[PDB]
Amino acid sequence: SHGLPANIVVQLNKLSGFKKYKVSDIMFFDRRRQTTIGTEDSFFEMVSIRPGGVYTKAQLQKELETLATCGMFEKVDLEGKTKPDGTLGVTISFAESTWQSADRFRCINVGLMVQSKPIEMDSDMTDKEKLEYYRSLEKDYKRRIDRARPCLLPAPVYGEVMQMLRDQGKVSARLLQRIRDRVQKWYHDEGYACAQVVNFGNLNTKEVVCEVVEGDITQLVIQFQDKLGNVVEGNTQVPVVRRELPKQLRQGYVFNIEAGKKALSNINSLGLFSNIEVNPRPDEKNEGGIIVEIKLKELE
């Protein structure tokens, strides 16, 4: 729905453009198995990018970042070949991370702390030096784990996730994919909308570390609108809205839609407003912090 190829069958890399490209077809390529992931494989849902969709340069970059930082691949690339008209196809290739069996499933809360970036360092990097380098990493990761917070995930889900490990016997990307959904299902079902599994740690032997951000609230925005939606100032009122927010909707708490509803129940009861919204949105830090946004249109 905008933009064009590099003319023509040349294969462009991820750096270009101020406009929204359209993608004719998506390919998901597995480097080690030398196969392609079918559109019905459901391992294809690792990709949020669908054919015929429109995405800016910034959006395709977040996709590559999400695939790279999740821990299921030690190499994952995103390339594209410009197609004659008027779109370009993309190829997401990858190499599954190297895994063993796992008898322990650990969940650590990385909300508000620094995210794991793949950060692959220099190769060769000699024999005895590389062997020390892994020990360097792992000692850092044990530091990161104990640095981290408890998660909210209740035991039975650990019980289920553990079984799936015993059932496969060896960790693959396909299994982590199921685990991430099962863990994420629980958070969302219980009302935590902004919770996500941001990574899978392999650095501890026979142990899967699941890093989640539960959606910690870092910010509160009260925005008055009218009429048809432009922002306007609410002067002397703004404190009277804040008292109607529950304790769990303020900063230092995990966002749950239950608190948004009670906030909505509270603010409604004042009888001052025609239109009221409570929506979370990610703040600019990308560490999992949440902005609580409240949109209001007055009566008078």
UniProtKB/Swiss-Prot annotation:
Subcellular location: Plastid, Chloroplast outer membrane
Expression sites by tissue: Mostly expressed in young and actively dividing photosynthetic tissues and, to a lower extent, in old leaves and roots. Particularly low levels in leaves after etiolation.
Disruption phenotype: Plants have an embryo development arrested at the two cells stage.
Domain POTRA: 1-97, 98-215, 216-299
Highest taxon, organism lineage: Eukaryota
Induction: Up-regulated by CIA2 in leaves.
Chloroplast intermembrane topological segments: 1-300
Membership in a protein family: Belongs to the TOC75 family.
Role: Essential protein. Mediates the insertion of proteins targeted to the outer membrane of chloroplasts. Required for the import of protein precursors into chloroplasts. Forms the voltage-dependent preprotein translocation channels (hydrophilic beta barrel) of the TOC complex in the chloroplastic outer membrane.
Record's comment describing the protein's domains: Contains 3 N-terminal periplasmic polypeptide transport-associated (POTRA) domains which may serve as a binding site for the preprotein in the chloroplast intermembrane space, and provide a chaperone-like activity to prevent misfolding or aggregation in the intermembrane space. Transmembrane regions consist mainly of membrane-spanning sided beta-sheets, which are not predicted by sequence analysis tools.
Subunit description: Part of the TOC core complex that includes a protein for the specific recognition of transit peptides surrounded by a ring composed of four proteins forming translocation channels, and four to five GTP-binding proteins providing energy. This core complex can interact with components of the TIC complex to form a larger import complex. Chloroplastic protein precursors such as prSS (precursor of the RuBisCO small subunit) also interact with these complexes.
Listed name of the protein: Protein TOC75-3, chloroplastic
Annotated source species: Arabidopsis thaliana (Mouse-ear cress)
